[PDB]
C-alpha cells in the first residue's frame, strides 16, 4: 500500500462548464417536449439551479433562440417547454453577473426498516412527511430531539 501512485501527468482537469451548461439546457429542453420532465418535479429544480450556476451571457442567447422558435402548435409539451424555458431564462438573466451558488433542493429522506410478511428486511430511505426541504431540515436540526 505504501507504493507511490501519484503522477502529475495522470491528472484529469475539468473546466468546460460553458459547454456542459449548453448541453444540459438542451438536454432538459427535449426531455420536456418528449414527456420526461414536468415543472413540478424536484430534480428539475436541481438541474435548473445547476444551469443558472453556469449562466453566461452566451448561454441566455442559447436558451432564447430555442425558446423563441419553440413551435407551440406541435403539442402541449411544447407549450410547457416554452413556459419553463422562458422562466429559466428570466432567472438566469438576474442570476447573471452574480455569484454561482450551491443550493441543494433535494427532498429530505429518512430511514425506514420494515420486515415483509415473507420475512425479508427492507431498508428504504423514504421521503419525510414533515421535512421536505433543507430549510425545514435546518429548523428541525435546531429543534433538538
Amino acid at each position: 500500500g505504501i507504493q507511490p501512485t501519484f503522477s502529475a501527468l495522470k491528472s484529469r482537469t475539468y473546466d468546460s462548464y460553458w459547454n456542459w451548461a449548453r448541453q444540459d439546457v438542451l438536454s432538459m429542453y427535449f426531455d420536456i417536449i418528449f414527456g420526461k420532465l414536468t415543472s413540478v418535479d424536484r430534480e428539475t429544480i436541481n438541474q435548473c439551479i445547476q444551469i443558472m450556476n453556469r449562466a453566461n451571457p452566451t448561454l441566455i442567447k442559447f436558451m432564447q433562440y430555442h425558446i423563441d422558435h419553440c413551435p407551440e402548435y406541435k403539442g402541449e409539451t411544447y407549450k410547457l417547454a416554452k413556459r419553463l424555458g422562458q422562466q429559466l431564462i428570466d432567472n438566469c438573466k438576474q442570476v447573471l453577473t452574480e455569484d454561482p451558488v450551491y443550493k441543494d433542493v433535494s427532498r429530505i429522506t429518512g430511514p425506514k426498516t420494515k420486515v415483509s410478511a415473507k420475512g425479508n428486511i427492507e431498508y428504504e430511505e423514504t421521503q419525510k412527511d414533515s421535512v421536505r426541504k433543507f430549510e425545514q431540515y435546518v429548523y428541525e436540526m435546531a429543534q433538538g430531539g
Binding site: 415543472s39 429544480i45 435548473c48 419553463l84 422562466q87 429559466l88 428570466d90 432567472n91 438576474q94 442570476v95 452574480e98
Partner: peptide
C-alpha cells in the same frame, strides 16, 4: 416557484 435573494426576519 422558479421566479432570488430572500431576506430573513426570523432566523
Amino acid at each position: 416557484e422558479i421566479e432570488d435573494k430572500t431576506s430573513i426576519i426570523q432566523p
